[PDB]
Design a protein around this ligand. Structure first.
Ligand code: CLA
Ligand code: CLA
Ligand code: CLA
Ligand code: CLA
Ligand code: CLA
Ligand code: CLA
Ligand code: CLA
Ligand code: CLA
Ligand SMILES: CC1=C(/C=C/C(C)=C/C=C/C(C)=C/C=C/C=C(C)/C=C/C=C(C)/C=C/C2=C(C)CCCC2(C)C)C(C)(C)CCC1
Ligand SMILES: CC1=C(C/C=C(\C)CCC[C@H](C)CCC[C@H](C)CCCC(C)C)C(=O)c2ccccc2C1=O
Ligand SMILES: CC1=C(C/C=C(\C)CCC[C@H](C)CCC[C@H](C)CCCC(C)C)C(=O)c2ccccc2C1=O
Ligand code: SF4
Lengths: 80, 105, 64, 163, 730, 105, 141
């Protein structure tokens, strides 16, 4: 039940998508960049809060932010 | 009572004798122990921000390092802690013992 | 030409940036209507280790 | 005198402390022979101890009821009652040395940054340049006020801020 | 279970239970909140804390009257020990009840340390009946407040938001009535009751109307001859209970202490709270409220703007900032109350206000440490609750160009110039102690760097102390300041300050010098940690938007080199370690300097406090002898309870090191292993938890470990402070 | 299974070993020294080590006939004095040595 | 993809003796995950929970209790052996859900069908202060 918002400064590196283990992020076409790509966060219900996505964004300041919030079974990474 | 308070009389009363070095190491070992607690209890985040406000003054006077100052890594702060921790904990016995036993009883 | 010249130094004005009120070389500029075309390169690294970032026209100004 | 402190010459506890510290060595000196090296070592320590006590008394120091010398910090009382060498004068002896270190390091930083690869110059120093600046810093207060009155000491809002 | 928050209730783990308690009284973040419902819920809750206070006081009175020796103490206050509450522990043995029954009472008891006996005896309480009658009074007042918190929450009797945001009426009613009239009445009590009870006369509800306080009555008050009430003061040879050596005065300005009871004159304290009532009533008629006259608060702040522009717009825009921000108002109150709490500590030990308190050495100590440790905790909250203002209740566009934005603009200068002072005091203070530790060790105690604190001795000479010989104005008979107040306060004041057997302006040496500077290291660096967490609360270069996350969050991740302990909560977290260290130095210095005074050997502190082995040898190691032998293998004394507590704090302190050093990831992998065993076991698997077990969160552990830390820091010193002072009785 | 079964042992030991020390402290402070764990008390003696001391002490007679004496005097025997100081003498194990040897585990 | 592949719950599993990192009571009650892939030969690979196992030529199937345990295996197979796995989510009610290649193309490659979600059209920072939203939730949305 975490929140993931991507901002206007994305450049279509795809490094955020490759890093997330839980497949929260995917690439969508867009007209704002040279690469003509942008990220997205359709399924944040599966988000866990590892912040590997933030680690990979090479911008001056991040085009991706994970705002932590209410927890859940999927978010807490509980096998039980 | 009978081990620590009692056998520490030879170390504490070592000032003015040949065992004076053990009395100082007994204290300095406590400093280095407590000094480790800054690294174990704290975190890199507070320190990297503090350095920024310090870099401002070093920048204001045009005296700043080209090698940017960065706080220690997380694993390093943990290593630095246990090192200064064990050194202070072990060196205290090294002073508490040799001063106690050289001055026999 | 839309923006600053190649190889020209410029000063940044993003408040968020690690390089704010600091100077860097213009690596390139795109003239295809992108929101953040101006590519800039600095000598000093940021906290992550990156020394480049795409800035905008309004966010950059002449040196010093 | 001042602050209810006696001079160290007139104090009794001061001389009591001298007779004590010498008695320890005399007892320690009885064990060894006259012409041995341990005897020569202790006699020298005896000679130094006798010299430490008389020199502190000769210097107009102030000893308290415990018998140990006390220092005075206000330059007014120090100059009025002739106790300036204690604190007031060493204050200027340090600041001359401390500013020496700043004026030197500040110049090495500025000059290496005017060239290519200044990062290498920090880990691998230019020793000929460092010695040159280190022997040119005898008159750092002149250069500071020269640089302040000129305005090339401080930077002007070309520094990074955070908000 | 949390009804105020649905987000936590959906949580299946144990994090729901823990976070439900900690976010309980944080009304702002609750679900479905409104600014109007917020003030009402606070107003009702603040009635509650009053209800516990008046009940807590009622419990002490009852448990003292029923089980104590108040009637026996007044007859011989010096020798008899007070009694707080009795003991019933069935796990005792026969040697313990024989040891703990030291009091005159039959069964075992606990000796008191608060000092309420000295306080109640001074204001005119001399019986156990009068305490029973009082315990009922506060329990009634306590129930009345509980009824009000419920009443003033109902649909009617529900104050509107405009009523809360009426500052001009609150000041006038609270300054005049709560402060002034209360201080006026307390003078009415000291005059009509207490001073007679000192001079033998028994005044109570039966006879307070018939008995006059003064022989003349009120006719001097109307005629204007107000000096008639200061004519025949109490003589020096005056017993505090009997009329031997008594007088007729009710208001006097004698100054100094009473000879027998080393305490302030009652006639002075009566005269004191009168003048305080006059200024505070006058100040209450200042602001404007429903009449034409009066000042306005907003008009004043807008006016005090300097013309040149050193402060920019100045204090403009601040009224709506303070009046709308509750965290701002709370920061100023705590910072004011936390400072006052230190004054109560500093000004009581020097000026004993109660009878036979200077003689009770154990009682003076606890009262000093209790208030100072509270003064640190409160003051650390002012900055913390001041940091929350910058996140939640700060509007930059409204507060543009004013003093509050101009401070936040150049914060890099404040945090930097602070770091210089902490480093400066830290290197040079430690370097001298270490310079003296060594040079003592090589047998040369004369080479120490002992600097005399001339500036403080200059004050004591300017305040009557003729020891140092500076011959300042008020130590000189020719000066006017000696001439003025010569008939009033100086004969009683000069006698006390020059007496070297009281705690009023103690003698100062080079040992006292190093500690007052080491104390400065604490305040300046503790402020640095808290100031930084406030100004950098909104953003840092490492985290440009902290404001979006909140006051308390664990971190932003391992990226950007690491972001552990950045939040403003983590700054408050680290300051408490310095708060405790600072108050420890302040308190260690009070105890030892007073023990040497009480033992008579003042030379112990002056010679040994210059090097740090003296603190470890002469203060800690030495005074921990009677305590540590509380339960010996041969037998047990009455100090066994303190030695047990003395270890109890040495243990709780160590348990916090777990939560501080060892962090979550080691434990959650461990709990996953116990979960596997609970399911694979044949019979235990039939039982299944309702809420899933998980390790404690990151922020929770910093809180928990700090509690286990601070409680051992306190329980350890309380045992040492009371046991060391009680066993020696001096 | 390893970490789970090993977790139970540490909890079993820290309770039954260190909890015994707290029991003795609490009993002493309450004035009940008869209920402590000690020699004059509810003795927990290390019977196994005591049996091994005697076996190695009475070995020269039977199990090592050609041995003129035992390996050390810690097992049993008489004192060996040198310069007015004892070099080694038999060490006796009691209730305290039981608790400490179990605290180490 | 062209069409979602429905689950074949009866396919051969790898040769694995067993371990303690398997499924717990949560799986039967709440949900569990299963992963499928097709190998050309018999190989050895590291399991996320436990040790090594031997794949089988043809389809293979595993059952896991977490999505990370499944995606951890995809990253191993896509890199080491260069395969194309696909995994689902199974509830206790028997319902099945096809998760990771939801469009048939992996997320790190664009596709025209996708639609953006949680896309703010502003720069990081440059957003309202918390005071403006003091009494409801959210400064970032
Ligand atoms: C002789 C002419 C004169 C002088 C000397 C002053 C002086 C002053 N006026 Mg003023 N005034 C004057 C004429 C004058 N006025 C006239 C003709 C008018 C028209 C009526 C006014 C109207 C006026 C108004 C309306 C106000 C003032 C105020 C002030 C005060 C602060 C102004 C300022 O810039 O802050 C100085 C600027 C700073 C930026 C402060 C620096 C802070 C330092 C650096 C911090 C150091 C802290 C650190 C912890 C130190 C170590 C301490 C440690 C030892 C404990 C100052 C005392 C203001 C006032 O009353 O506030 C007190 C105000 O509101 N003036
Ligand atoms: C005894 C333990 C101890 C000591 C010595 C310190 C010391 C310090 N802390 Mg600290 N801290 C501690 C425990 C300790 N802390 C604990 C338990 C916590 C809780 C987590 C904190 C939390 C904390 C915070 C949150 C902050 C500090 C800050 C500071 C600095 C204050 C400035 C000052 O006075 O420096 C000068 C004082 C000294 C004692 C200097 C130490 C160096 C001496 C001179 C020895 C020199 C080395 C010598 C030449 C030998 C070296 C050889 C060797 C390399 C082989 C200082 C470095 C503040 C800071 O850094 O701001 C500037 C700050 O913000 N600390
Ligand atoms: C904050 C620093 C500080 C402090 C607290 C003191 C404190 C004192 N100084 Mg002092 N002084 C200082 C710095 C300081 N000094 C400096 C930097 C100088 C210049 C070198 C002097 C020069 C000085 C002289 C020349 C004299 C004093 C004297 C005095 C004493 C009397 C009060 C006084 O100054 O006149 C009142 C000041 C009102 C502003 C007092 C102990 C006098 C003395 O000897 O006392 C007996 C005296 O004659 N001072
Ligand atoms: C010569 C270089 C140099 C200069 C001119 C300055 C200047 C300054 N520093 Mg800084 N500093 C330096 C190096 C330098 N720094 C280094 C290397 C460190 C890391 C240890 C720091 C860490 C530091 C802190 C943590 C703080 C300052 C602060 C300050 C300011 C107040 C002075 C002070 O507190 O001194 C303090 C000095 C020290 C704690 C130790 C300095 C180390 C040595 C003695 C000097 C370096 C000499 C250099 C290696 C020689 C190169 C010569 C070349 C020819 C080869 C001032 C602007 C304070 C501030 O924030 O400003 C208000 C402050 O709190 N400094
Ligand atoms: C007039 C006094 C006053 C008032 C009205 C408030 C009001 C508030 N504070 Mg504040 N605060 C104060 C003083 C005050 N504070 C002081 C003095 C400090 C400094 C210590 C703080 C530090 C502080 C922080 C750091 C935070 C608050 C927070 C809050 C908010 C409520 C949080 C909540 O429900 O926690 C309920 C919490 C609990 C029920 C847990 C408390 C458990 C304690 C720590 C255990 C104590 C030890 C144990 C019982 C000892 C037993 C002994 C044993 C041997 C038997 C609320 C606005 C929080 C906030 O606003 O969040 C944004 C927040 O983060 N306050
Ligand atoms: C907050 C106030 C307060 C506090 C902390 C206490 C505390 C205590 N009371 Mg007490 N009491 C109080 C108010 C208070 N009393 C009031 C207002 C009354 C009047 C009804 C009583 C009447 C009362 C009785 C009648 C008894 C206690 C007893 C006790 C002790 C029992 C242990 C326990 O869990 O409690 C304990 C020391 C019991 C005891 O044995 O005390 C030693 C006991 O028998 N109390
Ligand atoms: C004369 C009229 C009057 C009076 C007496 C009060 C009284 C009070 N109001 Mg109040 N109020 C009034 C009019 C009045 N109000 C009006 C007109 C409004 C509307 C504008 C309000 C609106 C209002 C609000 C909104 C709130 C209050 C609150 C309070 C209480 C403050 C908490 C407290 O107990 O502090 C007690 C303080 C003192 C007794 C004196 C000051 C203490 C300092 C530290 C001096 C210490 C002196 C001395 C050293 C102490 C020695 C002690 C001795 C035993 C050793 C207090 C009972 C609060 C409340 O409801 O709490 C339940 C609150 O939140 N008031
Ligand atoms: C004195 C401080 C202290 C104490 C008591 C403990 C205690 C413990 N640590 Mg530990 N730890 C500490 C400091 C401490 N730690 C520090 C500073 C660090 C950092 C290096 C660690 C790091 C650490 C690690 C890494 C591990 C532990 C583990 C353990 C547990 C071992 C199991 C065991 O024997 O418990 C049995 C119980 C006790 C020892 C408690 C002793 C006191 C008595 C018996 C309790 C009496 C209860 C009483 C009767 C009931 C009162 C109820 C009341 C409400 C009425 C135990 C809970 C291990 C663990 O949890 O896994 C097994 C583990 O892996 N600790
Ligand atoms: C951060 C913050 C905050 C906080 C703050 C604080 C907490 C503060 C501190 C501060 C403080 C806490 C202060 C203090 C003060 C004090 C003082 C300043 C005083 C002084 C005094 C004086 C002035 C006196 C004088 C005198 C007299 C009268 C007589 C005798 C002599 C003498 C000289 C002593 C707030 C909330 C606002 C908010 C925002 C942010
Ligand atoms: C203090 C601290 C820092 C800051 C520490 C730093 C930057 C290390 C400072 C190293 C100094 C520069 C070494 C030199 C010290 C003296 C100057 C040596 C004496 C030399 C004189 C004799 C000349 C961290 O970065 C940190 C990170 C993670 C967890 C905890 C901590 C932590 O506790
Ligand atoms: C031991 C430990 C745990 C695990 C500890 C656990 C699960 C113990 C908490 C549960 C026990 C059962 C509560 C024990 C009862 C307390 C003694 C009393 C609590 C009283 C409250 C109800 C008020 C963590 O989760 C952790 C997290 C982050 C850093 C360090 C640590 C850490 O050290
Ligand atoms: S990591 Fe950030 S910059 Fe890179 S493609 Fe993803 S959103 Fe864009």
């Amino acid at each position: 039940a975490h929140v993931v918002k991507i901002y206007d400064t994305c450049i279509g590196c795809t490094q955020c998508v490759r890093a997330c283990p839980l497949d929260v992020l995917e690439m969508v076409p867009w007209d704002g960049c040279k690469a003509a790509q942008m990220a997205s966060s359709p399924r944040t219900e599966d988000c866990v809060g590892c912040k590997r996505c933030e680690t990979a964004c090479p911008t001056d300041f991040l085009s991706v932010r994970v705002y932590l919030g209410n927890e859940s079974t999927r978010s807490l990474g509980l096998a039980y | 009572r009978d081990f620590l308070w009692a056998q520490s009389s030879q170390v504490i009363q070592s000032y003015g004798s040949a065992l004076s070095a053990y009395g100082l190491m007994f204290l300095g070992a406590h400093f280095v122990w407590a000094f480790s607690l800054m690294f174990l209890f704290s975190g890199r985040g507070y320190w990297q921000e503090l350095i920024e406000s310090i870099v401002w003054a070093h920048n204001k006077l045009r005296v700043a390092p080209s090698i940017q100052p960065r706080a220690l890594s997380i694993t390093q702060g943990r290593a630095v802690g246990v090192a200064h921790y064990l050194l202070g904990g072990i060196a205290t016995t090294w002073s508490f013992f040799l001063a106690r036993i050289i001055a026999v009883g | 030409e839309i923006g600053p010249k190649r190889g020209s130094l410029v000063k940044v004005l993003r408040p968020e940036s690690y390089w704010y009120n600091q100077v860097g070389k213009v690596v390139s500029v795109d003239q295809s209507g992108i929101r953040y075309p101006v590519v800039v390169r600095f000598e000093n690294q940021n906290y992550a280790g990156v020394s480049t970032n795409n800035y905008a026209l309004d966010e950059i100004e002449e040196v010093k | 005198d001042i602050a209810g402190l006696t001079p160290c010459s007139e104090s009794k506890a001061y001389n009591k402390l001298e007779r004590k510290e010498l008695k320890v060595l005399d007892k320690r000196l009885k064990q060894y022979e006259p012409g041995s090296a341990p005897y020569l070592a202790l006699q020298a320590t005896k000679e130094r101890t006798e010299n430490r006590f008389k020199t502190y008394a000769k210097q107009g120091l102030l000893c308290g009821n415990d018998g140990l010398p006390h220092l005075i910090s206000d330059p007014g009382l120090a100059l009025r009652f002739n106790h300036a060498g204690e604190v007031f004068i060493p204050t200027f002896g340090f600041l001359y040395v401390a500013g020496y270190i700043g004026h030197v390091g500040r110049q090495y930083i500025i000059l290496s940054k005017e060239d290519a690869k200044p990062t290498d110059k920090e880990i691998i120093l230019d020793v000929p340049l460092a010695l040159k600046l280190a022997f040119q810093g005898w008159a750092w207060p002149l250069a500071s006020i020269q640089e302040l009155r000129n305005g090339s000491l401080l930077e002007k809002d070309e520094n990074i801020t955070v908000s | 279970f949390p009804k105020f928050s649905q987000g936590l209730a959906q949580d299946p783990s144990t994090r729901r239970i823990w976070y439900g308690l900690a976010t309980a009284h944080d009304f702002e973040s609750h679900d479905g909140m409104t600014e109007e419902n917020l003030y009402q819920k606070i107003f009702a809750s603040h009635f509650g804390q009053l209800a516990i206070i008046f009940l807590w006081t009622s419990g002490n009175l009852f448990h003292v009257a029923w089980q104590g020796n108040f009637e026996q103490w007044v007859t011989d206050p010096i020798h008899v020990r007070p009694i707080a509450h009795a003991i019933w522990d069935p796990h005792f043995g026969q040697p313990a009840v024989e040891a703990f029954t030291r009091g005159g009472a039959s069964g075992p008891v606990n000796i008191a340390t608060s000092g309420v006996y000295q306080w109640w005896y001074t204001i005119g309480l001399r019986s156990n009946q009068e305490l029973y009658v009082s315990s009922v009074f506060l329990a009634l007042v306590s129930a009345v407040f509980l009824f009000a918190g419920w009443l003033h929450l109902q649909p009617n009797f529900q104050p509107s938001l405009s009523w809360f945001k009426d500052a001009e009426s609150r000041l006038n009613h609270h300054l005049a009535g709560l402060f002034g009239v209360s201080s006026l009445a307390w003078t009415g009590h000291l005059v009509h009751v207490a001073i007679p009870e000192s001079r033998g006369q028994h005044v109570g509800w039966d006879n307070f109307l018939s008995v006059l306080p003064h022989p003349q009555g009120l006719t001097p008050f109307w005629s204007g001859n107000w000096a008639a009430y200061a004519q025949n003061p109490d003589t020096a040879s005056h017993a505090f209970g009997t009329a031997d050596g008594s007088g007729t005065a009710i208001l006097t300005f004698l100054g100094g202490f009473h000879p027998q009871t080393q305490s302030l004159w009652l006639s002075d304290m009566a005269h004191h709270h009168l003048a305080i009532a006059v200024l505070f009533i006058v100040a209450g008629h200042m602001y404007r409220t429903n009449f034409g006259i009066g000042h306005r608060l907003e008009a004043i702040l807008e006016a005090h703007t300097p013309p040149a522009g050193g402060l920019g717009a100045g204090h403009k825009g601040l009224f709506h900032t303070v009046n709308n921000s509750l965290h701002f108002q709370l920061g100023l109150a705590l910072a004011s109350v936390g400072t006052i709490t230190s004054l109560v500590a500093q000004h009581m030990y020097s000026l004993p206000p109660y009878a036979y308190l200077a003689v009770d050495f154990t009682t003076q100590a606890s009262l000093y440490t209790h208030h100072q440790y509270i003064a640190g905790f409160i003051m650390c909250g002012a900055f913390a609750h001041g940091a929350i203002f910058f996140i939640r209740d700060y509007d930059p566009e409204q507060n543009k160009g004013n003093v509050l934005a101009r401070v936040l603009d150049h914060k890099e200068a404040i945090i930097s110039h602070l770091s210089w002072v902490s480093l400066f005091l830290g290197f040079h203070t430690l370097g001298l102690y270490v310079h003296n530790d060594v040079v003592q060790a090589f047998g040369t105690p004369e080479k120490q760097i002992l600097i005399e604190p001339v500036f403080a001795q200059w004050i004591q000479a300017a305040q009557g102390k003729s020891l140092y010989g500076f011959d300042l104005l008020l130590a000189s008979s020719s000066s006017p300041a000696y001439s003025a107040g010569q008939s009033l306060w100086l004969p009683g004041w000069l006698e006390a300050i020059n007496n070297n057997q009281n705690s009023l302006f103690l003698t100062i040496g080079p040992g006292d010098f190093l500690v007052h500077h080491a104390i400065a290291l604490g305040l300046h660096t503790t402020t640095l940690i808290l100031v930084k967490g406030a100004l950098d609360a909104r953003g840092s270069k490492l985290m440009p938007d902290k404001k979006d996350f909140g006051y308390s969050f664990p971190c932003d991740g391992p990226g950007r080199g690491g972001t552990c302990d950045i939040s403003a909560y983590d700054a408050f977290y680290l300051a408490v370690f310095w708060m405790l260290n600072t108050i420890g130095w302040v308190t260690f210095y009070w105890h030892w300097k007073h023990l040497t005074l009480w033992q008579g050997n003042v030379s112990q502190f002056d010679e040994s406090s210059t090097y740090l082995m003296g603190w470890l040898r002469d203060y800690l190691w030495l005074n921990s002898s009677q305590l540590i032998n509380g339960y010996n293998p041969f037998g047990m004394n009455s100090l066994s309870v303190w030695a047990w507590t003395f270890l109890f704090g040495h243990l709780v302190y160590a348990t916090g090191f777990m939560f501080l050093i060892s962090w979550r990831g080691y434990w959650q992998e461990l709990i996953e292993t116990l979960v596997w065993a609970h399911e694979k076991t044949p019979l235990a698997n039939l039982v299944y938890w309702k809420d899933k077990p998980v390790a404690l969160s990151i922020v929770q552990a910093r809180l928990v470990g700090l509690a286990h830390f601070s409680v051992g820091y306190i329980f350890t010193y309380a045992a040492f402070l009371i046991a060391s002072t009680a066993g020696r009785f001096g | 299974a390893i970490i789970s079964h090993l977790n139970w042992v540490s909890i079993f030991l820290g309770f039954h070993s260190f909890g015994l020390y707290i029991h003795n402290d609490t009993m002493s402070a309450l004035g009940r020294p008869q209920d402590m764990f000690s020699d004059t008390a509810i003795q927990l003696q290390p019977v196994f080590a005591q049996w091994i001391q005697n076996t190695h002490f009475t070995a020269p007679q039977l199990t090592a006939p050609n041995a003129l004496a035992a390996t050390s005097l810690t097992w049993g025997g008489d004192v060996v004095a040198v310069g007015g100081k004892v070099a080694m003498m038999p060490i006796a194990l009691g209730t305290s040595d039981f608790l400490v040897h179990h605290i180490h585990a | 993809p062209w069409k979602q592949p429905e689950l074949d719950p009866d396919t051969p599993s790898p040769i694995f003796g067993g371990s303690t990192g398997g499924l717990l009571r949560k799986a039967q009650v709440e949900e569990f995950y299963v992963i499928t892939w097709e190998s050309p030969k018999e190989q050895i690979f590291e399991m996320p929970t436990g040790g090594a196992a031997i794949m089988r030529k043809g389809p293979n199937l595993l059952k896991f209790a977490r999505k990370e345990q499944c995606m951890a295996l995809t990253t191993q197979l896509r890199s080491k052996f260069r395969q194309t796995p696909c995994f689902y989510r199974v509830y206790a009610d028997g319902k099945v859900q096809y998760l990771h290649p939801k469009d048939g193309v992996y997320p790190e490659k664009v596709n025209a069908g996708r639609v953006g979600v949680n896309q703010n059209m502003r720069s990081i920072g440059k957003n309202v202060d918390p005071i403006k939203v003091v009494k409801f939730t959210g400064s970032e949305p």
